[PDB]
């Protein structure tokens, strides 16, 4: 169903803040923001969709996503706060796309 202004703003906000959280998690852990984004995405989506990424220097394999998820889960509460932020952001991202699929159709019927 179609987003209300409130649901729209909420999801967009969650996306922005999850991206900021990935940046903060890169600052803390010294990992690669892309690697972190991919691991958070791998857990939000599921192992149903867990493939390799062309930019990542390390093959994204369940083993490596589990290792990185564990390195993340071992952080102090005030740091591990950003992991929950990022997971919330990815879920919002999926939901925001899915909610706006109809606008693409209404534009593409003209080309």
């Amino acid at each position: 169903p179609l987003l209300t202004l409130e649901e729209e703003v909420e999801l967009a906000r969650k996306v922005e803040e999850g991206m900021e959280a990935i940046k903060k998690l890169s600052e803390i852990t010294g990992l690669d923001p892309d690697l972190i984004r991919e691991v958070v995405r791998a857990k939000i989506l599921g192992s149903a969709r867990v493939r390799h990424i062309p930019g990542l220097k390390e093959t994204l394999d369940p083993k490596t996503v589990e290792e990185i998820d564990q390195k993340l889960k071992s952080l102090p509460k005030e740091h591990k706060r950003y992991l929950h932020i990022a997971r919330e952001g990815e879920a919002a991202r999926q939901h925001l796309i899915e909610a706006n699929l109809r606008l693409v159709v209404s534009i593409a019927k003209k080309y």
């Binding site: 202004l5 703003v9 906000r13």
Partner: protein
């Protein structure tokens, strides 16, 4: 949820299939209800003060403390509660009952408590001299439902008692939430001075907590039963 009409249920609690969620909403399924977009946030700020009242000694029901609604005295005839200070009147009428505060210059000089049954005979901002009637108590006067009398000290003098009540109550302040704002505080949480309640795009539109209190959420945009 239609505009303005409030929820018949509260955020966090389980509900039954078919159990109505609002005057025009019935839940097809069982589970935990959840609030979507609270459009009014009411904060009950907690106030603990000391106040006084003079009563005939015969009409007084001596107790060490008074719970709300409880009878505090019974007067056989009308009785005029009179001021024991000169000052300017500050009348704060709660849901039930009132507080008079007389103030001289920029300093408070007396704090009187009128429980239920006492009709205040003065208007806010009024000048009063000692002995003039501030309020009239008919009888069966009792505590309001919203305020409680923690401790009660008494002084006998002539044919009267002067009660020094350590009262504790809450005063509500509402806030209207706009669609571009998000409540960052859960239902029933305890804020201090300076704690943010609702965030907004620009800081001058934020909702920061004046004093201590609890948070209550009203009129959600919609309700999500999960």
């Amino acid at each position: 949820l239609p505009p303005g009409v409030d929820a018949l249920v509260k955020d966090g609690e389980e509900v039954v299939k078919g159990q109505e969620l609002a005057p025009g909403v019935v839940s097809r399924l069982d589970g935990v209800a959840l609030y979507r977009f609270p459009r009014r946030v009411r904060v009950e700020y907690v106030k603990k003060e000391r106040a006084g009242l003079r009563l005939p000694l015969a009409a007084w029901v001596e107790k060490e403390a008074y719970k709300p609604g409880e009878i505090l005295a019974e007067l056989p005839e009308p009785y005029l509660f009179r001021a024991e200070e000169e000052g300017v009147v500050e009348l704060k009428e709660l849901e039930e009952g009132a507080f008079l505060v007389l103030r001289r210059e920029d300093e408070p000089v007396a704090t009187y408590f009128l429980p239920v049954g006492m009709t205040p005979l003065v208007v806010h901002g009024e000048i009063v001299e000692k002995g003039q009637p501030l309020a009239e108590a008919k009888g069966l006067l009792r505590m309001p439902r919203q305020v409680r009398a923690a401790q009660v000290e008494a002084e006998e003098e002539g044919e009267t008692v002067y009660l020094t009540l350590f009262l504790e109550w809450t005063e509500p302040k509402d806030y209207r939430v706009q669609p571009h704002m998000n409540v960052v505080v859960p239902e029933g949480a305890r804020v201090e001075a300076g704690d943010k309640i609702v965030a907004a795009i620009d800081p001058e539109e934020e909702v920061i907590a004046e004093a201590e209190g609890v948070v209550h959420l009203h009129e959600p945009a919609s309700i999500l039963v999960v």
